[PDB]
What does this fold into?
Amino acid sequence: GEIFELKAELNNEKKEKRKEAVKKVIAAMTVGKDVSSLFPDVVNCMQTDNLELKKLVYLYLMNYAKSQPDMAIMAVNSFVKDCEDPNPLIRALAVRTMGCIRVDKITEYLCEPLRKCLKDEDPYVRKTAAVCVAKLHDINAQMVEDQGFLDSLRDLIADSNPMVVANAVAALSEISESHPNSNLLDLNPQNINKLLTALNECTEWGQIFILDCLSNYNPKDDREAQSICERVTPRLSHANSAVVLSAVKVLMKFLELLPKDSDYYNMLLKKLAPPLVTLLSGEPEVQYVALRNINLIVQKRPEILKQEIKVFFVKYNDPIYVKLEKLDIMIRLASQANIAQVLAELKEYATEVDVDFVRKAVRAIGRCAIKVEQSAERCVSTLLDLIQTKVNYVVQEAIVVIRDIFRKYPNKYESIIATLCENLDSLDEPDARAAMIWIVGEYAERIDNADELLESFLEGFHDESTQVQLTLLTAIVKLFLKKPSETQELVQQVLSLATQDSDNPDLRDRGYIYWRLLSTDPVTAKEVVLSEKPLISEETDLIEPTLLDELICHIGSLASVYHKPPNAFVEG
Amino acid sequence: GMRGLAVFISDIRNCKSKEAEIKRINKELANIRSKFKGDKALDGYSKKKYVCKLLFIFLLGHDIDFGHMEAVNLLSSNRYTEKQIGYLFISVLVNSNSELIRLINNAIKNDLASRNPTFMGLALHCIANVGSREMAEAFAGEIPKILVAGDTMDSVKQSAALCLLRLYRTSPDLVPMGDWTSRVVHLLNDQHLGVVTAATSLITTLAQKNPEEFKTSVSLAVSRLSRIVTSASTDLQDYTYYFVPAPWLSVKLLRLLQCYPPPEDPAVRGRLTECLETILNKAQEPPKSKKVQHSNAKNAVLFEAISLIIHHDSEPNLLVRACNQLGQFLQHRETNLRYLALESMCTLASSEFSHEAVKTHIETVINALKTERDVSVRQRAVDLLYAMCDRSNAQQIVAEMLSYLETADYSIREEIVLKVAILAEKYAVDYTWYVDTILNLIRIAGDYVSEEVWYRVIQIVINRDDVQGYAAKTVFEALQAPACHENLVKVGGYILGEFGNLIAGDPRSSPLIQFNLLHSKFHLCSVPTRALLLSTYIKFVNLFPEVKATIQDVLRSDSQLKNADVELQQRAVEYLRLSTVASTDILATVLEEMPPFPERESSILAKLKKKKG
Amino acid sequence: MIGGLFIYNHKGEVLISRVYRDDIGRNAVDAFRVNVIHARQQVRSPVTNIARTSFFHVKRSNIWLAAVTKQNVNAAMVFEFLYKMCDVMAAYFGKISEENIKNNFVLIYELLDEILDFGYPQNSETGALKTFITQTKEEQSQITSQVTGQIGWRREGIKYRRNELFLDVLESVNLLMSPQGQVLSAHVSGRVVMKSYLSGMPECKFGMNDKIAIDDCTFHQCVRLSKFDSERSISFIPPDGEFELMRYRTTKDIILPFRVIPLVREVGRTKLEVKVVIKSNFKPSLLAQKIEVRIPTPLNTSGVQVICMKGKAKYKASENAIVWKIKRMAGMKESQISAEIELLPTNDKKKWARPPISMNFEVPFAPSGLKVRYLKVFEPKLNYSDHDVIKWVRYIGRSGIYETRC
Amino acid sequence: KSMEQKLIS
Amino acid sequence: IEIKPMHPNNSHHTMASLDELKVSIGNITLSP
Amino acid sequence: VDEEGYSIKPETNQNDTKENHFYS
Amino acid sequence: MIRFILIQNRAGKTRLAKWYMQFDDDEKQKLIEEVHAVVTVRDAKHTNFVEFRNFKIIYRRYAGLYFCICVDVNDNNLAYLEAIHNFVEVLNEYFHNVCELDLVFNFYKVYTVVDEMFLAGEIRETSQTKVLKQLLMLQSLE
Amino acid sequence: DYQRLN
It folds into this structure.
C-alpha cells in the first residue's frame, strides 16, 4: 500500500528524517493499520541517545512484541543496558517498558535488572520496580525467585519514600487476587500504623490505594476500630470522590459499635452526611458514582441522610442519569412528614418529556403511596389527572402502579380502572398487560366483562411476555373457579397451550399443576388458587440484606455503580 | 465551465481550518440568498450556477433551509444540462413539506410523456432514484405501457425496466401483472444488451416466484457465452474486459435460473449441462492475466455458476467435481478466494451427492479456523464445520467450536452456542455427552446460552431415562461451584426438581443437602429464576417430606408470602396451601413425573434462522 | 485497574490509544465507537459495561476520552483521573480539541506513560511533569525525589522578583423556586482559586468566616488535612501558578440576585401571551452583567414575536426557547420582556409541558456572604514576609442552575 | 487539505 | 380493543355450586 | 516560565504594593 | 440489491453517497462514519468484503480513494468487486486519468456516470462503450 | 477587580 514508503523512511541517513518516520508509524498504529511488519526497522532506532525518540520506539515495541516473540529478542540487550543507565529516569523507563513486553524469554532476561531496580538507590526507580512486579505476576505468576519478589515487594511498604509504599500497597493488593489458602497476609498493628500515618504524606492516588487496602482489614476490640476511624475521618476533601468514598467505604465497614453504644457512632453518622452531599456538587460523572453509592448507604443506615431530602429535588437540566438516581433516592427518604413536598415535586417531574423519567416518576408515587398510608387517598388523586391527560405511556405505567396499590390497600380504589381504561388508547407495554390481566384476574366476579378481556389475550399467546403468559395462566383458572359454567372453553385453551405447545418447561409445569388440581380435587383447587394472599410490604423496591452488606464493602468500586457483586465482571 | 463554482470550491480546498469553512460556506448561503429574491432576474447560467453551489454544500454537510424552488424552475426547461442539475436536486433533496410534491410531479408528467430519449433519461430515472409514494401512485398505470418492446428507444426500456423494479419494491400493490409479461421475456432475445441486463433483473425480482411462466428464453442464456469462449482465443470486441467475455451479466442470468428448479425440456438440460462444463473448463486453463481483475470476473461468473449447480442438486457429475474445484481455493494464496470457497462450500455440505466428499476436506477448515485470523475469515469456516457435521464429525467438531467459543468475539457467541446446542443433540450416540456439552455451553458463554437452548436441555433430559440420574448428579455437582452462572441454576433447579430423588441416596446429596444448596442461590437470582426454584421447592416437598419442615418455613417467610412481584407471591402462597391443606395423595398426584415433551419443531433452529437479516 | 485509555473525535476516529493490560485489545477501542459514539439510543450513563468490559468516559469541546478496564476498579478514582489528565493536557497545549490533540500527539503518549503505570495513577501533578516532560546527577536525583516526595506541586526554589498572590472567590448560586416564588432548594457552591507567585517553599494559612457559616468544605491535596481536623487551620505549601485550594457549600442566608416572575395567559386555543419580569437584589452601586434569561416556548410554536424593555432577545426553534440578554443591570432595579406565540395544534391535545426559566448571570460579590479574613505566608530559609508580599482578593458569582418553575 | 492526483500506473 | 371496570364487594350470601365446576371440568380435555 | 533564575507572571493590572499604608 | 455505494478519501470526507433506501440523516452519517472505520484499517491480506449489520460491503482502495458497495447478503462478491473496478475504469476515460481533485470540481458529473452503470438498487449499463458515448454526446451538444 | 489585603 504505502507501508514500504515507511520501511524506506526509517533507514534514511539523516536521523531526524528517521524520527519523523516513527512519528508516522505511531499514528498508523493508533488508527488500526497493522504495521506488524515494520518491527525490525523500528528496533534499529532503539539503540539511540535521543530520548523523545527512544520513548516512541517503546510505545511501538510494547504493542507488537507479544505478537512477534521471535524478533522481539532484537530489543533485549538495549533494555538491560538502560536498567543500568546512570540517569534514573532512563532506568525507570527501560524497566517500566520491559515489564510490559509479554514473552517468556524476555520475562527471564528481565528478572536480572528488576531485582537491581527493587533495591535501587533512587525512589522513582523503586516506585517502578514495585509496579513492574504486578505486571510480572500477570504472567509467570509462579516465577519461584518471583515467589521471592513478593518478598522484595512486601518489604517496600516500610520503604522511606511515600510513592514506593503507594505502588507497593497498590501492586501487592492486585497480586493478592490469587487467594487459594495462605494469602492477603499483611494487616498487622506495625503495618497499619505506617499506612494510616502515610495516609497523609502519600499522594491523592496513594490515599485511595491505602483506604481500598484497609477496607479489607478486620479489627478486634472497639478501642482499636475507633482509633482507626479517627485517622480515616480527616479524609473529608479532594479526589472530590475517590479518597472521600474510599474513606466512607472503610468508615461504613467499621460500624459494629452497636446503634447508640457510644458518643462516637452518633458522631460518625453525623460526619458522613456533609461530604456525601458535597459529591453532588462535583462534575456530573462523580455526581452519578456518588448518587449510586448514597442509594446503597440509605438502605444500610437511613439515619445519615435521614432529613436531607431537599438535596434530591431533580432539576430540569440535571443530566438524566443524575435525575433517575435523585428520584429513586427521594422515595427511600419519603417520610410521614415530607410526602407533602415529595408528591408535589413528583407531579413537577411527570410533566417532563423523557419517557423513562416520567414513568420512573409516576411509579414513584405508587412506591410512595404503598410506603406512607396517609398519602394513598391523595397519592391516588395525582394518578387521575396524569391518567386524564390521555398520554398513553403514562396510563400504561399507572395501571402497573394501580395493581400493586390494590395489593397494599385492598380494593377501596376500584373506581380508577373504569377511568384509566377510557384514557388507555393502546396497551403495548408487556410490563403493563401483566397488571391489566391480573386485575381482571383477582376481580373476575366484579367484571361482567372479564371472559371477553381474557379471551382477547388468548388470540396472541406465543409472542407475549413469558409474564403475560404465566400471569394469564393464573388469571383464567382464577376466572374458571369463579365462573366455571361459562368459561371452560378458555381453560380448555389456556391449559392446552401451557401443557401441549409452550417450549418453556416452567410454564408447562404450571399448566399441569392447575390441570391436575382441577381434575383431581376441585375443593382443594379453589382453596389453593384463590387462597387469601397477605398485603405487600411498604419497602421501596429494596436490595437483599447480605447482597447489600457485600456492596457496602465495595463503595468506591464499580460494584457500587452497577449494584451487582463482582461476578458480573469477568476474570481478566 | 462555471467560475462561480470553481472560484467558491477553490476557496474550500485552499482552506486549512474546519471553522474557516463555517465562514466561506455561510458567506455562500448569504451570497445565493441575495440572488433570486431582490435585484433583476438572470436565467441560463444564473439559475444553473447559483443552484450547483447548493447541491455541492449539501455534500459538505450544511443547512439548505434558504433555497429549493430556485431549482424547481430548471425542471420544465429547454436544454439538457439545465434539467440535469434539477434531476440531481429532486434526487438528493425531496422538499421539506408536501408543497412542491404536486408542482414537482407535473414538471415530470410533461417530460416522461414528451417523446424524447434525453428528457425521459432524467424523468423515469428520478422515479427510480427517489421512489416516493406521490412519485409512485400517479405514475403506476404509466410504466407498463412505455416498456413494451416496440416504439420507445433502446436505452429508455432500461430506465423503465429499473423504475418498475424500484416502484414494484416501494409500491408492489400499484404493480399487479398484465400481459406486458410476454413482450418483456421477448426482451431477452435483444441486440442492445444494456436492455437485457436491465430486464434479466426485472424478470428475476418479480418472477422470482414463478419463472415456469417466463421460462421460454431460460435456455437461450447459453448462446451469449459458449460461442464467445470454446473455439476462438480473444473473441468479439464488445465487452472483452480482462479477457473474460462480458461478465457482470452472466451472473444476472445464472441468478434468474436459481429462482425455480432445473429445466424440464430434456434438450435444455443437455444444452445447459454442456454450458456448465464451459465454466468448469474456463477454470481448467491457467492465468492469462497476472493482475487480479481477470480471475475475479472469471470466478464472479464461475461462482454464480456453481451457485446454480448446487440449487439444481440433480447432476452428481457437476456436484462432487465442483466441490473438488472449491477444494483448490481453500489452500489458494488470496484470502477472498479461500473465504468464498468457505461461503459456497457451506451450501454443498448437506446434499447427499457431494457431502461425503465435502466432509473429507475438514482438517483444512479446522486448521484455517486455527489460522488466517480476522474474525470473518475463520467465522465463515465455523459455518462450514457446522454444515459438514454428522455423527462422525461431531465430538471433534463440538470440542473444536467449544475451543473457538472462549477466544471468539463477544458480538456473536450465541451464534456459536445455538449451533453447538443443535449439533450436540442432533448427533449424540451417547446422551451423557449431550448434557456435558450444554453444561460447557453454560461455563464458557452462559451469558450467551440463549433462552431456548436451556429449555431444550430440559425437554430432552425429561425424554431420556438413561441420563436423568446422571444429569441429576452432574447438575448438582455444578451448583456447588460457588460462582455458578444463573442459567446453571435455572437448569440444575428444574433438573433436581424432577430427578433429585436419583441422588438422594449419596450421603453428600441428601434432600436437606440439595434444598439447602438451591436456597444458597435463591437470594442471588432474578424473580423468574426464583419463581422456578419455588416450584422445585414444592416438588421437593413431595419427593422428600423429610425437609417439608424447612421448605414451608421458607414459603411462610415475610420475604416470600408478602412479595411485591405477582408470581413470586402467587406461587409462595399457592405452594404453601398445597403444603398444608392438600391431602397427601392429591399433592403426590399433582406433583407427578411431568410428562415427556412431544417430538416437535426444535425452536433453536428457528432462532439461528431469526439471527439472519 | 485502568486497562486502556482512548481519545476520539466527533466522528468516532481514534486520536490517541494507550493499552496498559493484555486484558484489553482492539476489540474494545472498536466496541466503544460502535456501542457509545455511534450508539442509536442515547439515554445512558458515563459508566457502561459491555461483555464484562467496563467503559468510563468524558466529553470536552467535540472530544471523547474513555477509560477501559476488565476489573472492579474504584469508579471515582477513574473519572477523577480522567479529569486530572484533561487538566494536564489543556495546561500543556491550551485547548483540548482534535487540532491540539493531533499536534502534541507525542507529548500526550510521553505523558500517558508517566502519569499512569500498569493502570495505577502515578503523579498527575502538572507542577512536576514540567521538570522532565518538555513541551547532571544531583540535577536528576532532585527532579525524581520531588516527583515521588510528599510535595509534588512545587519545583524547588525557582522564585519571583516580588513575592505576590491572588484569590478568586468564584461562587455559583443554585436555585429551584416554584412559580409562586417559594425557595424549594437553593445552595451556593464556591471555590477559592489562589495564584501563588510566592518564592521558595512558602508555608501558608488561610481564614474566612469559619464559624457566614459553611455547610461543608473540601480541599486540594496541598492543605495539611489533619491540622484542619484538630484546629481549623488550612495550612498548605501551595503549588506555584494557578490552583484550586478549596470548594465549599452554603445553604443559609443567600443573596439570591434575581427573582424571575412569570405570567402566562393563553387567549382561547391559538394565542399565547407571556410576560417575564426580573428583580435585581443587591447594593445598587454594583451591577450584575452577562445576564441570560432562557424563556422556553411551546413545541407547536408557529410565532416568533417579542418586545423587550431593556436588553435584546432572539427566539430559537430547535432550542424551542427565547434567549434574552441584558448588557448590564444595577442592583435593586426591575425589567420586563413580552412575547406573543402562535399555536398550530401539532399532536392530539396535550396541555403543553412547560420547562422552567433558567438564568446565566455574573455579579461582583460573594452571594454566599463568604469573605476572606486573612492569608498568612512564611518561608523560614529565604527571609521575606507579608510586609514585602503583595496580596489581592476578587469576588465573582455566576449562576450554576438558576431554575424558576413557570 | 493537500494535493492529490492519479488512480492508475 | 374494548375495555371495562369493576363492581363493589358483595357483603354476604349468594353461593357458587360445586356441581357447576365439576360439570364444567368433566367436559374439558386438551388440544394439540 | 524562567528567564534567568527568576519566574515571570502574565498581567496588565500592574504592581500595587502597600497602597497608602504603614509599618507602624 | 445494493443498499448504497460510497467513496471516501483515506481522510474520511464523503465523495459519493448514493441512497436507494429510506435511511435517516442520523443513520446516514453513522454508516458513512462506520463503513470508513471497518474499511480504513484492513490491508491486502483480508477479504475485500465483510458483513455489515444484516448485509455486507464490497470494496477496493485505489491509492487514496475508498470505493465501497453495501450490497445484499446473497448478491455476488467478485461480481460487485469488478462493478467498482469497471465503474472506476469508466471514470478513468471520462475525466482523463481521474484523481480525487476532479471528483470534486466535477462533483455533479459522476452522478451521471453512476445513474448510467447502476439504478434503483441494481446494475443498468456495463459497456465502457455505450457509457462513454451517452456521456460525451450528452455534453458536446446541450 | 482585585483589592489589596493585609
